[PDB]
Amino acid sequence: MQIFVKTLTGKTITLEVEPSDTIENVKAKIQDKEGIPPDQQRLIFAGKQLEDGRTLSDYNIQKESTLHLVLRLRGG
Amino acid sequence: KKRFEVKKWNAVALWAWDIVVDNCAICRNHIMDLCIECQANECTVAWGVCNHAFHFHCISRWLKTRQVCPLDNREWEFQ
Amino acid sequence: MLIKVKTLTGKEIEIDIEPTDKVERIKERVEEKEGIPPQQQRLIYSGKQMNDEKTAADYKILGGSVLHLVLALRGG
Amino acid sequence: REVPEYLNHVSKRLEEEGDRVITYLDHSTQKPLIACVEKQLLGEHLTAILQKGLDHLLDENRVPDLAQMYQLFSRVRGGQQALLQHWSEYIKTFGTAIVINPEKDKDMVQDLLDFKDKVDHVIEVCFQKNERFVNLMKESFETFINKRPNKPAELIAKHVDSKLRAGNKEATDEELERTLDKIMILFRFIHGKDVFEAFYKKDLAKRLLVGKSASVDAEKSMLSKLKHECGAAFTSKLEGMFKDMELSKDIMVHFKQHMQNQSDSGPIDLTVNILTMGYWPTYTPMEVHLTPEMIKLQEVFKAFYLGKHSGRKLQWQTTLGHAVLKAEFKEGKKEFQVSLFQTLVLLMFNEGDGFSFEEIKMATGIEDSELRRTLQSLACGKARVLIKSPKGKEVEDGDKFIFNGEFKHKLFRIKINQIRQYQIDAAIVRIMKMRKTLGHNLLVSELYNQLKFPVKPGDLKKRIESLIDRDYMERDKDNPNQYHYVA
Amino acid sequence: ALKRIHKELNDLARDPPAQCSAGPVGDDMFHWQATIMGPNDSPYQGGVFFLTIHFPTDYPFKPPKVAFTTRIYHPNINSNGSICLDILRSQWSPALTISKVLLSICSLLCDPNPDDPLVPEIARIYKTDREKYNRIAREWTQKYAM
Ligand SMILES: [Zn+2]
Ligand SMILES: [Zn+2]
Ligand SMILES: [Zn+2]
Numbered sequence: 001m002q003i004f005v006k007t008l009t010g011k012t013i014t015l016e017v018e019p020s021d022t023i024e025n026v027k028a029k030i031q032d033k034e035g036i037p038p039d040q041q042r043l044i045f046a047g048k049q050l051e052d053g054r055t056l057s058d059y060n061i062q063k064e065s066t067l068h069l070v071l072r073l074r075g076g
Numbered sequence: 077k078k079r080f081e082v083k084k085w086n087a088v089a090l091w092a093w094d095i096v097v098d099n100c101a102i103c104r105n106h107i108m109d110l111c112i113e114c115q116a117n118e119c120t121v122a123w124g125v126c127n128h129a130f131h132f133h134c135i136s137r138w139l140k141t142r143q144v145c146p147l148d149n150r151e152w153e154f155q
Numbered sequence: 156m157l158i159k160v161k162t163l164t165g166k167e168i169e170i171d172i173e174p175t176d177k178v179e180r181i182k183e184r185v186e187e188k189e190g191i192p193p194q195q196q197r198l199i200y201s202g203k204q205m206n207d208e209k210t211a212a213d214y215k216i217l218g219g220s221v222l223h224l225v226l227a228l229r230g231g
Numbered sequence: 232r233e234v235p236e237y238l239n240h241v242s243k244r245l246e247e248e249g250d251r252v253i254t255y256l257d258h259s260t261q262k263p264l265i266a267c268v269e270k271q272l273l274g275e276h277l278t279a280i281l282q283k284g285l286d287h288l289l290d291e292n293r294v295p296d297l298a299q300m301y302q303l304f305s306r307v308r309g310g311q312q313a314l315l316q317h318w319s320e321y322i323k324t325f326g327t328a329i330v331i332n333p334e335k336d337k338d339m340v341q342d343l344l345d346f347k348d349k350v351d352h353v354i355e356v357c358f359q360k361n362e363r364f365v366n367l368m369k370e371s372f373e374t375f376i377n378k379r380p381n382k383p384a385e386l387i388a389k390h391v392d393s394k395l396r397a398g399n400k401e402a403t404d405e406e407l408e409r410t411l412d413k414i415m416i417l418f419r420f421i422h423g424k425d426v427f428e429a430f431y432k433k434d435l436a437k438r439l440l441v442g443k444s445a446s447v448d449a450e451k452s453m454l455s456k457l458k459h460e461c462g463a464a465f466t467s468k469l470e471g472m473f474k475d476m477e478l479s480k481d482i483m484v485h486f487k488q489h490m491q492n493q494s495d496s497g498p499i500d501l502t503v504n505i506l507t508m509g510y511w512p513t514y515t516p517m518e519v520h521l522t523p524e525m526i527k528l529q530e531v532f533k534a535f536y537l538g539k540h541s542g543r544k545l546q547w548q549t550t551l552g553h554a555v556l557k558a559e560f561k562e563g564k565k566e567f568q569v570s571l572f573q574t575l576v577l578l579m580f581n582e583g584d585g586f587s588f589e590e591i592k593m594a595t596g597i598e599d600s601e602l603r604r605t606l607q608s609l610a611c612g613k614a615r616v617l618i619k620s621p622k623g624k625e626v627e628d629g630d631k632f633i634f635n636g637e638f639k640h641k642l643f644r645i646k647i648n649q650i651r652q653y654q655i656d657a658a659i660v661r662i663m664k665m666r667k668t669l670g671h672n673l674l675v676s677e678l679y680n681q682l683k684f685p686v687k688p689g690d691l692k693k694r695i696e697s698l699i700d701r702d703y704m705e706r707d708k709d710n711p712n713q714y715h716y717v718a
Numbered sequence: 719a720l721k722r723i724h725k726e727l728n729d730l731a732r733d734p735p736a737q738c739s740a741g742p743v744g745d746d747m748f749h750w751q752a753t754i755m756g757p758n759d760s761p762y763q764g765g766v767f768f769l770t771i772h773f774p775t776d777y778p779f780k781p782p783k784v785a786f787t788t789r790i791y792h793p794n795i796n797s798n799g800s801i802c803l804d805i806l807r808s809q810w811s812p813a814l815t816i817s818k819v820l821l822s823i824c825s826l827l828c829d830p831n832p833d834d835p836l837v838p839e840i841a842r843i844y845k846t847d848r849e850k851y852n853r854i855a856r857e858w859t860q861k862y863a864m
Contacts (some may be wrong), residue, residue: 005787008813009147010101010104010815020770022824035128035148040148040149044821044824046736046759047754047757047758066165068736070814070822071818072805073743073805073826074803074831074834075831075833075835076802076807080522082556083556083557084500085500085574086502087501087502087549087553088500088504089506089546090505090507090545090546091508091536091540091543093542093543094542094543095542103778104726107542108542112719113719113761134778134812141779144417146812147813156460157424157462157499162653164653165736177409190682192661195657199753199755200550201731201739202750203743204753217459218458218459219732223755225764225766226656228764702856
């Protein structure tokens, strides 16, 4: 199966992923797709950080879903 | 007796980009289309070592505000 | 015109309304195609909670102007 | 008595009673008498009258009797409400007859348009433009049109194509837009609108690339309704097509100048449309053995266009092109506006008066299934530019088509190209708010009655657990089966 | 620039973010009002918290002053409704658009950082006892968001 992600530049790209896949590989796929480093992504689904050490199946993600990409932030 | 000749012709052709629109992030325009400021009347595209595309008129101003690529955090240089 | 009332899950419910329908009409139309009675909606259009007496023309709702639907479980 | 005559009888009797009161009965008896007679004549036979007469009467479009019927039924309490039902149910009954039968596809839309105009007319004359009947007219059409998934949209899309086509010279400019306005009032009722675009887009794709649109002003008028009816997002891709046609002509001015500056200009007069690949219908590129003079013409253009816009790539569509081939017959010269396949195949029928089906195939390279379609256009059509051996409608691999040097046709220029998760949650709190106390069993029962989709027991329990966590619902201290409303 | 804000407004009207909604409040396009529906599986569930965006005169190259209008319980958001994101003060990036800053705020509603907090009084409660945090935030949401 595949998944949609909305990059920062307005474009949208589709990622070929499996539920068993971990988020680190997801960020690596974002990297080699367009190239912002694994550290700087912060994937958002339903207003939740997609934790690096987890997999899509953890977050209840299915086909034709959408993931949002932003720039890394922090508290204050 | 033997006559293989054509006299007119119409056709069509779909045009597609070489790699991708390469959407500028500062101004959200289309790369062949001019910079958003440059539209209001020679607006060239300048690359970063990230390969990131930005209109020169946008990235120059952003650099004048910050020596940092906006997408990636690396530094800005062309090829 | 068509307003597509997309909820949290991303499901994009289609709706049709005349330019002068009162927003109670919009909620009622959502009831038919989605099943939530008008008491439990809180339609949010472009960051303004629509009020139950305003006419749709007040908010400049056009064709394909996406609203947002959020459930108010209490809903009186 | 039949209902149409009976209503006249009731209309007569009420006025006599209305006349009696003015004559000698006290005015204070005006109301109880009228209600008394009205109750007995109609109040006790509302369903009986409507069933016997309304369904028959509506079909005949009998304007006066319905006007009498609606006028009379308003007097009874709940009489008008009883008229909405049997009138509403009539639409869903006769309406379904229009759409449900697939054998009526060719005559679908006009019935829907006609039947739409009829019911609207009854509202304007008989029912006095009653807003309540207008709504249930709209709500009812929305129902039965959608009892057939994705076909009404296709036929409405196909219908608009026929109206706009250059063959539609009969309907003038003013007549046409009124027809469209009636369609847009019908296109609103469809639910699968995203299927309408693709069918209307594919048809609109054919219209532009063969110049068969009757009126460009009618074209732009159509999108001005969809854009106003579905927003610029719905019609975004459509408007891109019109730009491409507009932009292409500009390219022709610059390209044509380049060839004039070159002393080596081929006799072939060239025009090429440049269309944004994203918007237009997806086409599968397919290779054809173009002639050495043919291959060059793209090369100068492709380099020229690329030289004027870097980063692009022009991949050609040989399928959508069309050329002219002036011919030298025995009774005058003729022109043939022919697609590229027809152009190449017809360029195989001069050196030899005929060639086998296979002899032509490796010469050009077209797919067999479409080459057969092309050859059929050159043999079986009305302009039989080939003689099929054996003669027949369909083409076979053994066919030795023979060029028609005895071709006769009236016109000089001729064409051949004819060939649920939150929903569960919302209902649970909604039901439980009214109840203030309930068990699991009834809460489960009312859900399927109140939810119009399947509900798994596992999914149903999970929402209950989730709602417990959010403090919406609370179990009894001693009865887990029994819940109580919290707030 | 306006043209940047115009393009953002159009591309947001066409393809809106899922649980976000922002549009101009009136004639002045530089003053938007937004709305962050509370992310699911959080104490803010079912909430609708209204922001108030203010774009500067050089918006692409200078952050917008977003500030909650609905009093939100959060270590990183003061009672006045002001946020202290690093992306919004120090590391503002033009590539980041309003549809993205709103979504990032929505994500941060569930991912606070009591270290270096804008409200240490709540930060201590969050760091020590998260069970009470999810109840005080819930009651604030119920008494302001619904
Ligand atoms: Zn520029
Ligand atoms: Zn970069
Ligand atoms: Zn730019």
